[PDB]
Amino acid sequence: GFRKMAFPSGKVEGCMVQVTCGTTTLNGLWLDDVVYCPRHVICTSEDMLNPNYEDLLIRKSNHNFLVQAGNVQLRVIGHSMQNCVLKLKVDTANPKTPKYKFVRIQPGQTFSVLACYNGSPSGVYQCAMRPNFTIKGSFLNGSCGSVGFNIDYDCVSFCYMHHMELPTGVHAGTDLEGNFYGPFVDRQTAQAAGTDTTITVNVLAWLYAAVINGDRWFLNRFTTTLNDFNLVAMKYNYEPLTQDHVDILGPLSAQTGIAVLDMCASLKELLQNGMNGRTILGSALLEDEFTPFDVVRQCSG
Amino acid sequence: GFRKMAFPSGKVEGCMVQVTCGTTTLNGLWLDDVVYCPRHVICTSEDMLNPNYEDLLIRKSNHNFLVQAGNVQLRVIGHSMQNCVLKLKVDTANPKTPKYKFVRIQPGQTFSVLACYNGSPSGVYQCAMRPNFTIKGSFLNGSCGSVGFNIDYDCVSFCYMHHMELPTGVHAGTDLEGNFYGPFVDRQTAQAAGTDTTITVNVLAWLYAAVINGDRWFLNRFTTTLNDFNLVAMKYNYEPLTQDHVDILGPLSAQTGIAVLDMCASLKELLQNGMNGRTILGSALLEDEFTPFDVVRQCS
Ligand SMILES: *[C@H](O)[C@H](C[C@@H]1CCNC1=O)NC(=O)[C@H](CC(C)C)NC(=O)OCC(C)(C)Sc1ccccc1
Ligand SMILES: *[C@H](O)[C@H](C[C@@H]1CCNC1=O)NC(=O)[C@H](CC(C)C)NC(=O)OCC(C)(C)Sc1ccccc1
């Protein structure tokens, strides 16, 4: 009874533009009078094999950047590089700018991606940041500069800007200050995703969701300490819990009356014993890409 | 990778408004100077058990309808009813009205849903019209009047307006002419759907998606005729595959070098032997809510 739901994308659609240098076009994000985009737009395909970004940029001027909203050019009046993002000052404040902030998310957190090509949105879908700092997205050539976001009340929190596709078909990128998630660098040289793990806090959220819906055969009579649970979980390639994880499970723990550590003890028994052919929420697989906020957002509205 | 992907919802967000009658509140769709919404907004709790809608509606006045676009009330200057949809004429045009049309979709087709509450957009996701004319949505109290749609070029094709949830947790609603998909009625009584089936052409498209993304453990060296495949399909409550379906799958067959009927032979083996605890594109079940067009677009 659960599905990945994206946030409504309109507030972000109103911020997408295209940025071109020479023949390289990608997407940018226009907020107030600044356009944010991946810095590799300044690279020729041959530069991308081995770029010196400081030296490539010092040779650029405002008049080398073509920024367009649709087919309408936005004149660039300044430029600077902040980590792996380029910031282009433009002479028009975007009238569709929403209330916004820039946030750096943690593994396990989910967000919506608005996949764009040539400044035009094509589709929206929900992603989770994996513990290895990749996302399992859907991106083609020309998608760089597409962004990921959450919407809280009136306010768009941008958390991801897209830069790269790894050999295993997963994706990597930066926050809006240009800092990559994970060890990746914006160079066209062989790179690989590390070994991934299961997002424990989200599996627990999923078990809480099952309980809310009356599916609770897996609740046991025991508890555990956080440290004992973390040490066991790692033997099953599950992530250890942080204090922040315990706290973000607070609302679901209060809603169900099941202490976080009792649920941990139930999960430990599932890991140690298996499902024994039973299902939870209709599935024999434990889901790890629904956060506690996602569960609340779909169970209680 | 390969994700369930919805259309960007902005063009539809600019059309959602809130409609209240009495203590009943739901969403409407504001296009030009008309607001469309489910007619059961005019019902009280008592009315919903057995509503004579023409009789209930004649007793309403324009001023009984409170329409709000954000923090602005829109004055209703006229109303009519078209099947299960109420059309409220308002004194102001929506400047955010997109290019649009109203279409009635076929079972197996997919669309995006913009789930809304009190006229405010809440989430967007992809659904398919099931063969039994339900949809597996995520809708709560206050979601009625949320709409489903596709976007082609700049044109929004509205295909679904939400009205109800069935005891099994699936959903039912109408096209924008107010006619239900399926044998359902907008009355507060328990209703069951016909036996559902699996959308075979969509399962095949998703198998081809799994191969494009380098996952082909399920393939085999065998083949099958169209009719022999269909005999097995129907036995497992899968929809029949037509020659038009085979034709529609051509691009995906060309892209991958796997003849359609060879992929049919693969699916036959999956149906007869199961997945042996294995997974395809992360799923432990055969997914049937991607169309061939959906797969092609997201891989092109
Ligand atoms: C920007 O639009 C583009 C998005 C990619 C293209 C296809 N799908 C995507 O998500 N980004 C890139 O092409 C990126 C640019 C550099 C970071 C400057 N290159 C890239 O992602 O290459 C990946 C490698 C070379 C780092 S790893 C790899 C992947 C496949 C095969 C071999 C090696
Ligand atoms: C409109 O916002 C509302 C949407 C529903 C609410 C919960 N999820 C939805 O999708 N629509 C209705 O509540 C609808 C109004 C009638 C058409 C007049 N009623 C409705 O959907 O009720 C279904 C039931 C309760 C009659 S079927 C059932 C379900 C569980 C147990 C027993 C019977």
Q: Per the CB < 8 Å rule, is A4 touching B138?
A: no
Cβ contacts of B150 within 8 Å, gap of 6 or more: B7, B110, B111, B112, B156, B157, B159
Q: Per the CB < 8 Å rule, is B6 touching A1?
A: no
| Closest Cβ opposite residue B13 in set A4, A8, A285 | A8
B125 neighbourhood in chain A, CB within 8 Å: 3-6
- The residue of chain B with its CA nearest to that of A125 is B5
Instruction: For residue B95, give the 3-state DSSP assignment.
Output: coil
Least distant ligand from the CA of B1? 1
Residue nearest to atom 13 of ligand 2 (CA): B164
How would you class B3 by CB atoms within 10 Å of its CB: exposed for 0-12, middle for 13-18, buried for 19 or more?
buried
Q: Which two tokens stand for residue B238?
A: 């899968």
Range of the domain at B59: 11-90
Q: Per the CB < 8 Å rule, is B138 touching A5?
A: yes
| Closest Cβ opposite residue B1 in set A11, A13, A137 | A137
> Rounded to whole angstroms, how far apart are CA atoms A262 and A253?
10
Q: Is the CB of B188 under 6 A from ligand 2?
A: yes
B262: domain CATH number is 1.10.1840.10
- For B6-69, the DSSP string reads BPP-HHHHTTEEEEEETTEEEEEEEETTEEEEEGGGG--HHHHTS--HHHHHHT--GGG-EEEE
Cβ contacts of A97 within 8 Å, gap of 6 or more: A14, A15, A30, A31, A32
CA of B140 to the centre of ligand 2 (A): 9
* Residue whose C-alpha is closest to residue B147's, from B133, B160, B165: B160
> Rounded to whole angstroms, how far apart are CA atoms B18 and B120?
8
Output the CA torsion sign for A142, A9, B157, B297. Answer: positive
Output the CA torsion sign for A281, A282, A286, A291. Answer: negative
Direct distance between the N- and C-terminal alpha carbons of chain B, in angstroms, rounded to an integer: 12
Q: Is the CB of B276 under 6 A from ligand 2?
A: no
Q: Per the CB < 8 Å rule, is A137 touching B3?
A: yes
> Rounded to whole angstroms, how far apart are CA atoms A281 and A277?
13
Residues in chain B: 300
B26: domain CATH number is 2.40.10.10
Q: Is the CB of B82 under 6 A from ligand 2?
A: no
According to DSSP, the residues that pair with B183 across neighbouring strands are none
Q: Is the CB of B268 under 6 A from ligand 2?
A: no
Residue nearest to atom 12 of ligand 2 (CA): B164
Size of interface A-B (CB pairs under 8 A): 94
> Rounded to whole angstroms, how far apart are CA atoms B156 and B137?
20
Helical segments of chain B, H only: 10-13, 45-48, 53-58, 200-212, 226-235, 243-248, 250-256, 260-273, 292-298
Smallest Cα distance from A242 to chain B, Å = 27
Q: Per the CB < 8 Å rule, is B5 touching A139?
A: no
* Residue whose C-alpha is closest to residue A298's, from B196, B100, B283, B115: B115
> Rounded to whole angstroms, how far apart are CA atoms A239 and A81?
35
Q: Is the CB of B26 under 6 A from ligand 2?
A: yes
According to DSSP, the residues that pair with B26 across neighbouring strands are B19
A150 neighbourhood in chain B, CB within 8 Å: none
> Rounded to whole angstroms, how far apart are CA atoms A57 and A248?
43
Mode of pairing for the β-strands spanning A72-74 and A66-69: antiparallel
A136 neighbourhood in chain B, CB within 8 Å: 1, 3, 282
B286 residue type, one letter: L
CA distances from A22 to A43, A246, B27, B119 (A): 9, 50, 47, 44
Cβ contacts of A55 within 8 Å, gap of 6 or more: none
Q: Which one-letter DSSP state was computed for residue A114?
A: E
> Rounded to whole angstroms, how far apart are CA atoms B137 and B183?
18
* Residue whose C-alpha is closest to residue A296's, from A199, A205, A203: A205
Q: Cβ–Cβ contacts within 10 Å for residue A277, how many?
A: 6
> Rounded to whole angstroms, how far apart are CA atoms A196 and B62?
59
| Closest Cβ opposite residue B114 in set A8, A297, A301 | A8
Question: For chain B, how big is the Rg over CA atoms in Å?
Answer: 22
Q: Which two tokens stand for residue A197?
A: 């793990």
Check if the beta carbon of residue B178 is closer than 8 Å to that of residue B82: yes
Q: Which atom of ligand 2 is nearest to the CA of B172?
A: 10
Ligand 1: which residues within 6 Å by Cβ?
A 26, 40, 48, 139-144, 163-167, 171, 186-188, 190-191
B137 residue type, one letter: G
B124 neighbourhood in chain A, CB within 8 Å: 5-9, 124
Q: Per the CB < 8 Å rule, is B1 touching A171?
A: yes
> Rounded to whole angstroms, how far apart are CA atoms B62 and A63?
57
Q: Which atom of ligand 2 is nearest to the CA of B187?
A: 18
> Rounded to whole angstroms, how far apart are CA atoms A148 and A249?
23
| Closest Cβ opposite residue B298 in set A11, A138, A283 | A138
> Rounded to whole angstroms, how far apart are CA atoms A74 and A68?
6
> Rounded to whole angstroms, how far apart are CA atoms A94 and A15?
7
